[PDB]
Amino acid sequence: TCPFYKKIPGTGFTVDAFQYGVVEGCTAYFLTHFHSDHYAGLSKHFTFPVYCSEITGNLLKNKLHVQEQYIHPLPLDTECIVNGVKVVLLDANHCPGAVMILFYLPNGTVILHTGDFRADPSMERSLLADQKVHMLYLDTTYCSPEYTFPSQQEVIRFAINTAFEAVTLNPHALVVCGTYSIGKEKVFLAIADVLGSKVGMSQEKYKTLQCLNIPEINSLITTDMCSSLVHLLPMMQINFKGLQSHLKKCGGKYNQILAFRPTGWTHSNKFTRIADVIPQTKGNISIYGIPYSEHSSYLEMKRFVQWLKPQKIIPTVNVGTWKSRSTMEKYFREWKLEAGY
Ligand code: NI
Prior knowledge:
With 341 residues, this protein is of the alpha/beta class. The protein has two domains: 1-147 and 296-341, 4-Layer Sandwich (Metallo-beta-lactamase, Chain A); 148-295, Rossmann fold, CATH 3.40.50. The chain is built from eight helices and 18 strands. It has helices spanning 36-39, 54-63, 152-169, 185-194, 203-209, 240-249, 298-308, 322-339, and strands at residues 7-8, 13-15, 28-30, 50-53, 71-74, 80-82, 85-91, 99-104, 110-113, 135-138, 173-179, 199-200, 221-222, 230-234, 256-263, 280-282, 285-291, 312-315. The chain has a seven-stranded mixed β-sheet with strand order 13-12-14-11-15-17-16, sandwiched between helices. The site of nickel (II) ion (NI) has 4 residues, from loops. It is found in: Nucleus. It comes from Homo sapiens.
């Protein structure tokens, strides 16, 4: 049964609520982004209307084989009417096709559902600027002060320089990058670009990346592993056994692997600067964990909320414990008092 925080009151709408069968009174199902925790339950047998972005629509049709007639893509930054309710989709600065959703309720309430997001000051000059928000359904993944990490730009810089150094020292080194879902594509795209290679991957991943409207994509990726010196593998295989095995497959083309695991946050952020990061090494294999996040830091989250000044905040992540709920309400109150709303 559907939790209250996936219901938009005063409408027939839910958000990211596909794992509860037929939700009583829901006449349209919104999907914020193609991550499995959020799409859990969708398949080709789904017969209610789904509303999402164009990219999310591509993946529904091609990967989950949902039927065309039930997929309703909407343009971003465009006031649209759905079952008599004005809505807007906004870029969530998360993974490709990921959106925030504004609901303008009949009674005059305004609701923002962030989906998954990484807050940015650029959001302060969207169609959010023009009016008040009464309720915020907030991605609270890292709502605690200890969750710090760098900008995406600094991390990519670290990765690019690391990889270019290693391959210029050893032309026979291979670079590997782990993956298990969409998002974080810049990590492998940037590395392949500075090395002047295409990124090589399995057919199922190539199919997925083909759904994402990246410009010039056919120039950047390929299924021919033999022609590329940047390979993507499942995240699970990014370890000393998985990598030794894969090196064997390359038939003595390469004598060294440099691999990258893009995590979210790790406790090595409480002490170490991005510049200071070092690999785990075994023989001719090195592994870097790099903190490339597609969720708000604590400070980025605080800044957005303090800018938005909502009247009520409803968390969508870390809701399952009392300790977590309690902690989050404290920070909300602090933020409210500090900025005076
Ligand atoms: Ni997500």
